[PDB]
Amino acid sequence: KWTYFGPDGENSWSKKYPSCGGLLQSPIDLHSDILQYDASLTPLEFQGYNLSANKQFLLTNNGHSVKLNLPSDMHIQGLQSRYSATQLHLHWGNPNDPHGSEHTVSGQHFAAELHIVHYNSDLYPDASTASNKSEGLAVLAVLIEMGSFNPSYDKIFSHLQHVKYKGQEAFVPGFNIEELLPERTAEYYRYRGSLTTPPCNPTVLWTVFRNPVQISQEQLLALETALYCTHMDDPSPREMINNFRQVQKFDERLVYTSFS
Amino acid sequence: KWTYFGPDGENSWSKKYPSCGGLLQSPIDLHSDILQYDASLTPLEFQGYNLSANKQFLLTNNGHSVKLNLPSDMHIQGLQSRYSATQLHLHWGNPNDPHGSEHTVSGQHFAAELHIVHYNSDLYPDASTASNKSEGLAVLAVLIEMGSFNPSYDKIFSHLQHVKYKGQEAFVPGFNIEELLPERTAEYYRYRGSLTTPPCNPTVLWTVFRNPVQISQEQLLALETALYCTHMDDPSPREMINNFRQVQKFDERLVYTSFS
Amino acid sequence: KWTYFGPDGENSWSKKYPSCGGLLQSPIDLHSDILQYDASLTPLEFQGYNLSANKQFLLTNNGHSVKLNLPSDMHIQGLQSRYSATQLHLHWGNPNDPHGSEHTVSGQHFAAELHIVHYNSDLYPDASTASNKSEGLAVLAVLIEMGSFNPSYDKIFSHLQHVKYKGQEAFVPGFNIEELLPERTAEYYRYRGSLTTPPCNPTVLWTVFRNPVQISQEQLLALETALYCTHMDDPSPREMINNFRQVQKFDERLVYTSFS
Amino acid sequence: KWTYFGPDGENSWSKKYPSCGGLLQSPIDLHSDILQYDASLTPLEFQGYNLSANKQFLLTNNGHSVKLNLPSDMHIQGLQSRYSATQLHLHWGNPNDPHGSEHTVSGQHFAAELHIVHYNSDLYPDASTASNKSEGLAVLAVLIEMGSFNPSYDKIFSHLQHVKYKGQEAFVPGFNIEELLPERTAEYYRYRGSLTTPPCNPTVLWTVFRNPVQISQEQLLALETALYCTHMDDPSPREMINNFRQVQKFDERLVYTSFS
Ligand SMILES: Cc1cc(-c2ccc(S(N)(=O)=O)s2)cnc1-c1cccc2ncccc12
Ligand SMILES: Cc1cc(-c2ccc(S(N)(=O)=O)s2)cnc1-c1cccc2ncccc12
Ligand SMILES: Cc1cc(-c2ccc(S(N)(=O)=O)s2)cnc1-c1cccc2ncccc12
Ligand SMILES: Cc1cc(-c2ccc(S(N)(=O)=O)s2)cnc1-c1cccc2ncccc12
Ligand SMILES: [Zn+2]
Ligand SMILES: [Zn+2]
Ligand SMILES: [Zn+2]
Ligand SMILES: [Zn+2]
């Protein structure tokens, strides 16, 4: 058991999850002093992201985020190995302070953040295996700010009232996950990091796109208010808000950019 | 044993010091969504801050920071109690990333941060018994930015190369401590928080001045490069750099401002 | 009554020493699939390793290796028990194939290997008693590759031409044993294993440092050609070469690393 | 009784099978220091390897491997004597660590290894007579790696669910065995060695082909998960995994290559 608030909150993760107090922890603040252009970074190519409408995909409240399962025939090209998709999920703040991205840029929090998790499907049979091993995972991160209505993000958010509580589940018809990504995917930040939640394994290769996406005022408030961390009858219900980790120390180490 | 790096670093403080994973932790990011103007916040008066030039004051490398002992006849006027000074010390980054303040403003790290530590002398007989009790401590924070040489700060910094190693001490002739304070001390952020180092006692009334002071690049580099956490003859020395805590979650609370 | 070649070689050790065909045998091949990061592995401290230069320490050819006796005031700090030093020795190949390390990394042999042997002095009165008992021993392993001359190793290797035959003894003045260790001793592999020689007791907590040291081409050749397994007057001399065990099966088990 | 794990495992083979602790043991690591080009080595020709589809060949789980019986009208030309076939079988690792070849190349384990066993039909009347006599046996070894699906190897793998336990047998229709061999069979390593299982007779002339073949992830996982070392009625079942011998010392001896 771990939470984002109170006694089992993130300063206490290291007790049961020692890696949370270990190496290569994420997320981080992306600022000029630790950036470095790498001319050899190539654009990712996104394959099998256009999910068939006649198929459906499981959405789950896992008590920490809302999660959509993704098929292993969905994959990224442009890394050392083929990585196949396993799931995506989100991180957000709260109505009084709607800044709940994990990564920050020059000290600025965005409204929210999308993570699309992949496992090394050349080396490893499944995400389970891959999660605590070298070269294990590749996570794509999209920064989300307030703006115009996003019909693509609403393909997820229109389902939130069916996964209000921990353990609940709902099917979503296939849509084009590539619509979730920003402008000019070629431009990104890349560094070696970790899971941002327990167990905090340092097995993730991070790609954070430079350019944010927009969702409406209304869409963001919906996401911040829809969900609970607790089961259909915990005596003490807890709202799912502020489900992001504080940025970590990042000392004598480098984040590589595909832009100058 | 605690540090700012490695297995004894801040994510693991909670394992030896339970308060570091509890409530009311410092430091924090000061941003609009959690600020509120409070016109009842009156100017502090700084009494006995003009230390006798004929007296000397102990400077010490304690392995975590550099610390100057302060006399009990030094005190803050204008709080519910009189608070008497006990010591001051600093926090800083590193030459490759010179942004090591503890508190941030709108996401932005300053170069360094000065802390003038006081205890409630009305209620308690010394800082020791005040430290972990209600209304025990008040800390004044000055944010420090790189720019102009600062003669007053140099009355401390000129002694740095003579306390390079843990346990070493020097004497500092009395000078006017009020000269370390920024302009318009009437303007400040106020909130209830904690020590930013173990034991992380949540017993601190924080006053962070609105306006930064400046020190020279040269002053900053001396601060960032002169000092070691280790004793003189340790075969493997460790540099005293990045001795600041990351900002903490601050939800469902307000910081009060004396300026609008 | 055992060798590293022919009928009394390692496939036959189990006929004379039951533990050599038992569980938890060393050495092993260190490869990604059986590695796991463990943030709980903190740095050892090497205490009393700076041996008095006014003292001398017995170096012996015992017919299997060259051995340096070590004082019991020398010890490892940072394990559950104190482990006190008893001897160090080496393992090597031969000039025709100079890859005689015991542990391998991703299949690759290094030139040679140093073992520094310690016993659990909290639990047990001497190394003799600890040798075949629970948590009895702890061995530090340094992988040795051929490269730059090493003055510290030469404090040993300079005496080799005076212990050429079995039973012969020389005195080595005290020097700093820490100088035999590599860079970044905080980085290591840890696993539960056995003596690599008869009687092969499965009582050893192994720490293999991640990073090798270098010794010169000339130092390596002296190690591989100076010593004999036989007594001086024996008309049939056998050269002390290839005195390393092959790697053992390692299944249903993990090696824990302090690095990722 | 002998096994690849625990107290009857490979370090104990010598107790009842003396030759396992003897001369000329296999397998070995093939690395530059012990290789020598030999221009007189000629290519093998493979005769009667295209087995009639109208005949049947017995597949058996023998408790140590899966074996396919072969006819003696299958032979190799290109050695000193005609060698005629008796069986083929395989060696493999386990799902967590899918590296179970017997021979290694520059320290690298491949996924698995195929052995095609032949006996000297010029000198001896049958494989049994030949097995423990001078010039008795010749074994071809093919190294196997993860890659594309291999429909030729599936002519074996598709019958595995019929031989899950020791003693169980199934007939396989003839296919072309030459389909199991890699590209450029003319390039190979040759050396004098032994059976890699008890009784470890030193009577094998080994040919290991330079180039590996590929099978899919699913085929390799199939092979590693299908079979048991124990009978139908064993109360203590054991999965058939890691059925490969560790590499042997190879001192004062040469492997000859057909390529330079
Ligand atoms: C692949 C995976 C990612 C995650 C993630 C946690 C946090 C992230 S995030 N915030 O993108 O860094 S991804 C959690 N669990 C698994 C996972 C998936 C499937 C089986 C697992 N078995 C053991 C441990 C973890 C397993
Ligand atoms: C009051 C006090 C605060 C602190 C502080 C640690 C960190 C801060 S900071 N970073 O301003 O929050 S203040 C350290 N020592 C004492 C202190 C001062 C004097 C005597 C003490 N005796 C026992 C324990 C602590 C004593
Ligand atoms: C504790 C010990 C380990 C060893 C070792 C044999 C092999 C290793 S190695 N290759 O590090 O695994 S360490 C040798 N001698 C002693 C030892 C040391 C001192 C007294 C002894 N008395 C009886 C038996 C052994 C004694
Ligand atoms: C059973 C057997 C195994 C082997 C082999 C055992 C291991 C290998 S391998 N792993 O290719 O080196 S080949 C060779 N010939 C025979 C053989 C085959 C047929 C009859 C026999 N009679 C007596 C002894 C051996 C006989
Ligand atoms: Zn995430
Ligand atoms: Zn402070
Ligand atoms: Zn040894
Ligand atoms: Zn075989």
| Domain assignments of chain B as residue spans, ordered by start | 1-260
Rounded to whole angstroms, the Cα distance separating B110 from B90 reads 12
B partners (3+ CB pairs within 8 A) are A, C
* Secondary structure string (H, E, C) spanning chain D: CCCCCHHHCHHHHHHCCHHHHCCCCCCCEECHHHEEECCCCCCCEEECCECCCCCEEEEEECCCCEEEECCCCCEEECCCCCEEEEEEEEEECECCECCCCCCEECCEECCEEEEEEEEECCCCCCHHHHHCCCCCEEEEEEEEEECCCCCCCHHHHCCHHHCCCCCCEEEEECCEHHHHCCCCCCCEEEEEECCCCCCCCCCEEEEEECCCEEECHHHHHHHHHCCECCCCCCCCCCECCCCCCCCCCCCCCCEEECCC
Distance CA A163, CA C139 (A): 54
Q: Is A203 on the interface with C (CB under 8 A)?
A: yes
For every residue of C212-228, DSSP letters joined together read PEEE-HHHHHHHHHS-B
Phi, psi of D191 (to 5 degrees): -160, 165
d(CA B222, CA B98): 12
Q: Which of B206, B214, B213, B215 is nearest to B256 (CA)?
A: B206
Residues counted in chain C = 260
What DSSP letter does each residue of B152-218 carry, written as one string? HHHHHHTTGGGS-STT-EEEEE--BGGGGS-S-TT-EEEEEE--SSTT--S-EEEEEESSPEEE-HH
- In total, chain A counts a number of residues equal to 260
The DSSP-derived string for A152-215 is TTHHHHTTGGGG-STT-EEEEE--BGGGGS-S-TT-EEEEEE--SSTT--S-EEEEEESS-EEE
Integer-rounded Cα radius of gyration of chain A: 17
Nearest to C13 by CA among C184, C176, C200: C200
Name the residue type at position D49. Answer: Y
Q: Which residues contact C139 (CB under 8 A, 6 or more apart)?
A: C115, C116, C117, C118, C204, C205, C206, C207
Instruction: Mark yes or no for CB contact D246/C251 under 8 Å.
Output: no
Residues in chain B, how many?
A: 260
Token couple for B76: 């803050």
Query: Which tokens sit at B200?
Result: 């992380």
Question: How deeply is D76 buried, as exposed, middle or buried, from its count of CB atoms within 10 A (0-12, 13-18, 19+)?
Answer: buried
Cβ atoms of residues C21 and D7 within 8 Å: yes
CA distances from C125 to C27, C74, C115, C133 (A): 27, 15, 22, 12
Give yes or no for residue C77 CB within 6 A of ligand 3: no
Beta bridge partners of A140: A116, A207
Tokens of A134: 């070298």
Distance of CA A259 to the CA centre of its chain: 22
Please report the sign of the dihedral spanned by the C-alpha atoms of residue A59, residue A62, residue A65, residue A70.
negative
User: Do residues D83 and D135 touch, judged by C-beta distance below 8 A?
Assistant: no
Q: Is the domain defined by D1-260 classed in CATH 3.10.200.10? A: yes
The experimental method, as deposited, was: X-ray
Does the beta-carbon distance from A134 to C32 stay under 8 Å? yes
Max CA pair span of chain B = 56
The rounded distance, in Å, linking the Cα atoms of D113 and C68 is: 44
Strand segments, DSSP code E, in chain C are 29-30, 35-37, 45-47, 56-61, 66-69, 75-77, 83-92, 104-105, 108-109, 112-120, 137-146, 169-173, 188-193, 204-209, 213-215, 255-257
Check whether D31 is labelled as a binding-site residue. no
Structure tokens at D128: 């049994």
Alpha-carbon distances of C241 from C13, C92, C93, rounded to whole Å = 18, 7, 6
Q: Do the Cβ atoms of C188 and C105 come closer than 8 Å?
A: no
Asked if C238 and C168 touch (Cβ cutoff 8 Å), the reply is: no
SS3 call for A220: helix
By the 8 A CB rule, do B221 and B241 touch? Answer: no
Q: Would you tell me how many other CB atoms lie within 10 Å of the CB of residue D220? A: 25
Tokens of C198: 């008869």
Residue that is written with structure tokens 């490969």 in the block: D244
Please state, in angstroms and rounded to a whole number, the distance separating the CA atoms of residues D71 and D118: 10
Report which bound ligand comes closest to the CA of B92. 6
Beta pairing, strands A213-215 & A137-146: parallel
How far apart, in whole angstroms, are the C-alpha atoms of residue B120 and residue C100?
A: 68
Torsion of CA C127, C131, C132, C133, to 10 degrees: 60
Q: How far is CA A92 from CA A220, B24, B37, B161, in A?
A: 9, 22, 27, 47
Q: What per-residue string of b and e applies to B129-167 under the rule 16 or more CB within 10 Å gives b?
A: ebbeeebbbbbbbbbbbbeeebebbbbbbebbeebebbe
Q: Measure the CA–CA gap between A99 and A181, rounded to whole angstroms.
A: 19
Task: Extract the tokens encoding A114.
Answer: 């999308």
Counting atoms of ligand 1 from 1, which one is nearest the CA of A136?
1
Q: Which residues contact D19 (CB under 8 A, 6 or more apart)?
A: D194, D199, D200, D201, D202
Strands A255-257 and A35-37: parallel
Helix (H) or strand (E) holding A81: none
Of C200, C184, C91, nearest in space to C137 by CA? C200
In chain C, % helix, strand, coil (3-state, to 5) comes to 15, 30, 50
A129 is in an annotated binding site: no
Cβ-contact B234, B240 below 8 angstroms: no
Listed in order, strand segments (DSSP E) in chain A are: 29-30, 35-37, 45-47, 56-61, 66-69, 75-77, 83-92, 104-105, 108-109, 112-120, 137-146, 169-173, 188-193, 204-209, 213-215, 255-257
Residue B6 CA to its chain's centroid (Å) = 23
Q: Show the tokens assigned to A244.
A: 């992001």
Q: Where are the alpha helices (DSSP H) in chain B?
A: 13-16, 127-130, 151-157, 217-225
Give how far A236 is from chain B: nearest CA, Å. 18
Q: How many CA atoms lie within 13 A of C9 on its CB side?
A: 23
DSSP C148: S
Q: How many CB atoms lie within 10 A of CB C191?
A: 22
- Strands (E) across C64-111 are located at 66-69, 75-77, 83-92, 104-105, 108-109
Cβ within 8 Å, pair D11-C20:
yes
Q: Does C119 contact ligand 3 (Cβ within 6 A)?
A: yes
Q: Distance between CA B10 and CA B27 in Å, rounded?
A: 12
Long-range contacts of B11-16 (CB under 8 A, 24+ apart): B11/A10, B11/A11, B11/A13, B11/A14, B11/A20, B11/A21, B11/A25, B11/A248, B12/A14, B12/A21, B13/A11, B13/B198, B13/B200, B14/A11, B14/A12, B14/A14, B14/A15, B15/A14, B15/A15, B15/A21, B16/B198
- Sequence-separated (6 or more) residues with CB below 8 Å from residue B110: B99, B101, B103, B104, B143, B144, B145, B212
- Asked if D132 and D201 count as a contact pair (C-beta separation under 8 A), the reply is yes
Cα B240 to Cα B220: distance, rounded to the nearest angstrom? 13
DSSP state of A43: P
Q: Which ranges in C44-150 belong to alpha helices (H)?
A: 127-130
Annotate A225-236 with b (16+ C-beta within 10 A) or e (fewer): ebbbbbeeeeee
- The tokens of D99 are what? 């590296």
Nearest CA in chain D to A129: D96
Residue B130, token pair as written in the block: 């005040």
* Phi, psi angles (nearest 5°) of residue B169: -135, 155
- What is the C-alpha to C-alpha distance for residues D77 and D42, in angstroms, rounded to an integer? 10
Q: Which of C11, C110, C146 has the most D C-beta neighbours within 10 Å, making it the best mutation to test the interface with D?
A: C11
Using most ligand atoms within 8 A of CB, pick from D90, D131, D143, D194 the residue to mutate for ligand 4. Answer: D131
Closest CA to D132 of D198, D52, D185: D198
Beta carbons of D48 and D54 less than 8 angstroms apart = no
CB contact under 8 A, C178 and B235: yes
C-alpha torsion sign, points D173, D179, D181, D187? positive
**Residue A80, number of CB atoms within 10 A of its CB:** 11
d(Cα B245, Cα B258) in Å, to the nearest integer? 26
Number of residues in chain D: 260
Dihedral sign (CA B121, B124, B127, B130)? negative
- Note the Cα A96 to chain centre separation in Å: 22
- For A15, which of B14, B94, B107 is closest by C-beta distance? B14
Structure tokens at C243: 């005195």
Torsion of CA B169, B170, B175, B178, to 10 degrees: -30
- The greatest distance separating any two alpha carbons of chain C, rounded to the nearest whole angstrom, comes to 56
Q: Longest C-alpha distance within chain D, in Å? A: 55
| Dihedral over alpha carbons B170, B174, B180, B186 (to 10 degrees) | 140
CA distance A67 to A127: 15
Rounded-to-integer distance, Cα A248 and Cα B137, Å? 28
The Cα of C201 is separated from the nearest Cα of chain D by a number of Å equal to 14
Q: For residue C12, give the 3-state DSSP assignment.
A: helix
Decide: helix, strand or coil at residue B123: coil
C155 three-class SS: helix
Strand partners, D214: D145
For tokens 């409070």, the residue is B38
What's the alpha-carbon Rg for chain D, to the nearest Å? 17
Resolution (A): 1.7
- Sign, Cα dihedral of B38, B42, B48, B51: positive
The protein residue whose alpha carbon is closest to atom 5 in ligand 3 is: C195
Residue among A142, A147, A114 nearest A216 (CA): A147
Tokens for A140, please give them: 């794509």
Alpha helical stretches, state H, A43-160: 127-131, 154-157
